[PDB]
């Protein structure tokens, strides 16, 4: 298992927006309490889950805890960059698993909830 994705960067700037703020306090919290959050609340432990070549196939591991700690650190550039990390998290799951499997069903239920929540987002 590689190190978890970065949460800070010295060469990268920091800002917050009313949208990012909505992503943390509303979107991320909504998903975080979803029934199916827990496989995604922390980086995938490919070792202990026995995922073959997980980190060869998945070149951008993403997870809601990395998202979370990024949002609290205002690591992100804008709401766009944060949504994309969410999108990466679901996509990673559809790339690595057979369509129809439990985990994919779970990512799909989180994604649909995610989608409805991102419509509540204002444009800055
Ligand atoms: O793409 C993934 C592939 C699967 N599998 C596990 C079972 N064989 C089929 C492939 O597992 C995950 C997880 C995950 C699942 C269960 C967890 C978990 C993470 O962490 C806490 C303990 O239970 C996040 S993505 C992802």
Residue numbers in the entry: 44 to 167
Give excerpts from the publication.
BRD4 contains two bromodomains, BRD4BD1 and BRD4BD2, that recognize acetylated lysine residues in histones and non-histone proteins. Of the four members of the BET family proteins, BRD4 is the most thoroughly characterized, and its aberrant activity has been associated with NUT midline carcinoma, colon, breast and prostate cancers, neuroblastoma, and hematopoietic cancers. BRD4 overexpression has been shown to promote tumor growth by stimulating transcription of major oncogenic drivers, such as MYC. In this study, we report the biological activities and mechanisms of action of thienopyranone (TP)-based inhibitors with increased potency toward BRD4 and selectivity toward BRD4BD1.
Consistent with the docking screening, replacement of the morpholino moiety in SF2523 with the piperazine moiety in SF2523P led to a substantial, ~ 40-fold increase in selectivity toward BRD4BD1 over BRD4BD2 compared to a ~ sixfold selectivity of the parent compound SF2523. The IC50 measurements showed that adding the piperazine substituent does not significantly alter inhibition of BRD4BD1 but substantially decreases inhibition of BRD4BD2. In all complexes, the thienopyranone moiety inserts deeply in the binding pocket laying parallel to the α-helices of BRD4BD1, whereas the benzodioxane moiety of SRX3212, SRX3212P and SF2523P is oriented toward the ZA loop of BRD4BD1. The carbonyl oxygen in the thienopyranone moiety of all compounds forms a hydrogen bond with the amide nitrogen of Asn140 and a water-mediated hydrogen bond with the hydroxyl group of Tyr97 of BRD4BD1. While the nitrogen atom in the piperazine ring of SRX3212P and SF2523P is unrestrained, the oxygen atom in the morpholine ring of SRX3212 is involved in a water mediated polar interaction with the carboxyl group of Asp144, which likely accounts for a sevenfold increase in potency of SRX3212 compared to SRX3212P. Although the hydrogen bond between the side chain amide of Gln85 and the dioxane moiety of the thienopyranone scaffold is conserved, restraining SRX3212, SRX3212P and SF2523P, the presence of the pyrid-3-ylmethylaminocarbonyl benzodioxane moiety in SRX3212 and SRX3212P altered the hydrophobic contacts with Trp81. The indole ring of Trp81 flips over ~ 180° in SRX3212 and SRX3212P compared to this ring’s position in SF2523P, enhancing its interaction with the benzodioxane moiety. However, SF2523P induced CSPs in the fast exchange regime indicative of a weak interaction in the micromolar range (right). In support of IC50 values, the NMR titration data demonstrate that while adding the pyrid-3-ylmethylaminocarbonyl substituent causes a moderate increase in selectivity toward BRD4BD1, the piperazine substituent appears to be the major driving force of the selectivity. The ability of piperazine-containing compounds SRX3212P and SF2523P to associate and inhibit PI3Kα was also decreased as measured by kinase screening assays.
